[PDB]
Amino acid sequence: RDLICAQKFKGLTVLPPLLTDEMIAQYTSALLAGTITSGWTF
Amino acid sequence: GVSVITPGTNTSNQVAVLYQGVNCTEVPVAIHADQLTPTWRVYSTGSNV
């Protein structure tokens, strides 16, 4: 029940990134769709 | 951490407050009890959440 991420109590926190994993996946999907359907033209 | 989100004092004096890493069923809601100081901060507001 004791987690290694209980470093918050010593003042050490982690900030979440601006782009989520879903948004990075959507950027990657847009890159793949453009590369497959349009070549280098996009 | 407390983060203050402002559009700039040239535009408006309205701010939005981000209490970093905590839930807001857990944020102290002493809005009209701020003069009694149960908080490290003095300011307290009750805007849209």
CA A20, CA B49: separation in Å to the nearest integer? Answer: 22
């300011």: which residue's tokens? B43
Distance of CA A25 to the CA centre of its chain: 8
Q: Which two tokens stand for residue B22?
A: 């905590």
CA B22, CA B18: separation in Å to the nearest integer? Answer: 9
Contact A5, A13 (CB under 8 A): no
Which residues are bridge partners to B4 per DSSP?
B17
For the beta carbon of residue B44, count every other beta carbon within 10 angstroms: 17
CA B47, CA B1: separation in Å to the nearest integer? Answer: 19
Residue A24, min C-alpha distance to chain B (Å): 22
Residue of B nearest to A12 (CA): B1
Looking only at the bridges linking them, the beta strands covering B16-19 and B2-5 are: antiparallel
Tell me, yes or no, if B46 comes closer than 8 A to chain A by beta carbon.
no
The technique is: cryo-EM
Angle subtended at Cα A32 by Cα A22 and Cα A38, rounded to the nearest 5 degrees? 140
Residue B35, min C-alpha distance to chain A (Å): 27
Chain B CB contacts of A13 under 8 Å are: 1, 20-21
CA B13, CA A34: separation in Å to the nearest integer? Answer: 43
Half-sphere exposure of A25 (CA within 13 A, CB side): 3
